[PDB]
């Protein structure tokens, strides 16, 4: 409870840790610690009744977040580990189930079968892109195919739990935590032309309530970098 | 010089042979190894994780997220089949496109057990009770609440726990995993009633496969 780090402090009270290994460190690279390790709290999304799902690309939503947006831009190469906190707060009269999963190398397919989706559609800068509950049309030029039952990658949506995941069951459970190591082939890769992770949240059992409660449930997501290292003389 | 003799089967090419081969590019000094996390060394490791079963197909909720959600509401009749599905191997059943099913469509012989982990996703104030009857193969499907209690079964409270795990063998009638209403759903006021149920499938890490083949889910 009341974990403190850097100059920002949040409060917790069961954590699933990646593929078993705790994130650790290794021209000459530098290891900055005093100006980066802080809990960057993203802005909160609203979970309506007929919602679909959201995603964030992980070394892209931290591109405007203060000092980290300089250390990504001044240092092209880099390698980091992450720590995610997702908690949605509601009463005892709400109901629903979330699936929080953190997929590595999440390639998405365009709507048109011959093109590829543009950059401003794959990753909103520190903002949640949203899934849809219908099909994305064919007549548009460059837009991401975001049918929720296939999760954008052309896979069965129920089979996504092979990745590091966690269930949020609003009847009993309340929060989820992930710890993700740096999973890439090349040890020091460019951070601008690469999105090595993707944090998805899909509602399986949709939100339901009675008349009189609040008609939305807010979800807050908090990311915290770890093992941040860059390249530069 | 040294006398030899060529046996038959000498200038032939077998598709599944293993002989030492000449390299095309020597002196390449190949890029070394790295401890990348998350290594798999046996394909049964994929089958141990849990995956959601699309048990609510009914030709209309197939292309949506209502395929995984079983509707449960407080009706007026006491005792009706909530859901039910057979366990026929491979013949278009509901366990076909899950993660356990997509590996076991590569082999022809397999024999072992299955964890069917359930989960009630409703409100935190609602109670109820459910029967989870498994019928052994050869015996008929139970058409009543009473004889389902006579078979092997497990009563599932909702207020105490929210997940009751059932173990069942599965071979290459064949069985039914039907589920019956024991009581209604007691709710307080200002709480909705139409709660849903998720279902998971797994491997009980105790079955082997033989005689590899290809899958039929391709052109």
């Amino acid at each position, epitope marked *: 409870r009341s974990i403190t780090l850097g100059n920002s402090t949040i409060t917790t009270q069961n954590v699933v840790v990646g593929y078993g290994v705790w994130p650790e460190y290794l021209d000459q690279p530098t290891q900055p610690d005093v100006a980066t390790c802080r809990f960057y709290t993203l802005e909160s999304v609203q979970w*309506m009744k*007929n919602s679909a799902g959201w995603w964030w690309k992980l070394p892209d939503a931290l591109s405007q977040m203060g000092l980290f947006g300089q250390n990504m831009q001044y240092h092209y190469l880099g390698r980091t580990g992450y720590t995610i906190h997702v908690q949605c707060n509601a009463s005892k009269f709400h109901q629903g189930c979330l699936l929080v999963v953190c997929v590595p190398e999440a390639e998405m397919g365009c709507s048109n079968l011959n093109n590829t989706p543009e950059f401003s559609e794959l990753s909103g800068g520190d903002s949640a892109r949203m899934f849809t509950d219908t099909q994305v049309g064919e007549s548009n030029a460059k837009k991401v195919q975001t049918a929720v039952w296939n999760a954008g990658m052309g896979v069965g949506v129920g089979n996504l739990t092979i990745f590091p995941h966690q269930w949020i069951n609003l009847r009993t459970n309340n929060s989820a935590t992930l710890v993700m190591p740096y999973i890439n082939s090349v040890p020091m890769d460019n951070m601008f032309r690469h999105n090595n992770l993707t944090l998805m949240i899909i509602p399986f059992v949709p939100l339901n309530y009675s008349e009189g409660s609040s008609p939305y449930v807010p979800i807050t997501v908090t990311i915290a970098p770890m093992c941040a290292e860059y390249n530069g003389l | 010089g040294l006398p030899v003799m060529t046996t038959p089967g000498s200038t032939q090419f077998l598709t599944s042979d293993d002989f030492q081969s000449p390299s095309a590019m020597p002196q390449f000094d190949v890029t070394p190894e790295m401890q990348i996390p998350g290594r798999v060394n046996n394909l049964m490791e994929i089958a141990e994780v849990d995956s959601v079963v699309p048990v609510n197909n009914t030709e209309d909720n197939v292309s949506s997220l*209502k395929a995984y959600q079983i509707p449960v509401q407080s009706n007026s009749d006491n005792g009706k089949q909530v859901f039910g599905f057979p366990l026929q191997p491979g013949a278009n059943n509901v366990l076909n496109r899950t993660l356990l099913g997509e590996i076991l469509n590569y082999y022809t012989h397999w024999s072992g057990s299955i964890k069917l982990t359930f989960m009630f996703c409703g409100s935190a104030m609602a109670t109820g009770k459910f029967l989870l009857a498994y019928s052994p193969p050869g015996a008929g499907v139970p058409k009543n609440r009473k004889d389902a209690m006579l078979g092997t079964h497990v009563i599932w409270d909702v207020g105490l726990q929210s997940s009751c795990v059932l173990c069942v063998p599965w071979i290459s009638a064949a069985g039914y995993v039907t589920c019956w209403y024991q009581t209604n759903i007691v709710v307080p006021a200002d709480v909705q009633s139409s709660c849903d149920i998720l279902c998971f499938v797994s491997a009980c890490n105790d079955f082997s496969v033989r005689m590899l083949k290809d899958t039929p889910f391709i052109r």
Partner: antibody
Amino acid sequence: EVKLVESGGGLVQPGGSLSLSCAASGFTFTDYYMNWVRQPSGKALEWLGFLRNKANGYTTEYSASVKGRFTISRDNSQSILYLQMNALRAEDSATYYCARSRYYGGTYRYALDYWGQGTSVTVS
Amino acid sequence: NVLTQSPPIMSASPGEKVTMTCRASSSVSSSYLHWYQQKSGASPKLWIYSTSNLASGVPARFSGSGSGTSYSLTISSVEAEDAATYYCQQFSGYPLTFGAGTKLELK
């Protein structure tokens, strides 16, 4: 009870523009999909394109033949709908309706249950 | 995808069993085909959705069936108020294409 009234029909020269307006009453506007179907006089129906609700991020999907020349946009303040027309031709002489779509079970079927009265747009 | 309704012109006396068909150029799903009814210069109204489920506020005589690429609709008895037009709608992909039309006049 739903009651969708639409206005803005009348004379327009070819090569110009036109802006229709379709008002909504009897429901919360940010929970139902809004469609637009034109019908030529005595001919088969053709669907133009729709607009999603607040929970889907307010996106649009037009048809293939009429993409670009039109634009579906909503107002955030009141339960009202706009339809921008640009560079009309002589063959868009039809009447324009206002349709609503809703969920039947828990999924999304593609039917349009409740329709407006229909305003008539002709060209010269 | 196009929809070949057949036939466009029918007339019927009160009391008979009348069928109309909707045949698709491809294999359209049973959950993506609906029926409408439009009176003489009036607003069109949904009649049957998803090929088996009646709408709200319709009599119980109308029922439809069919699967694959051909779908049909069956009325028990011809009455006095149901001489109008009919259309079937489909969705396998975009665009949403409509049918040719079934015009019905009383006898």
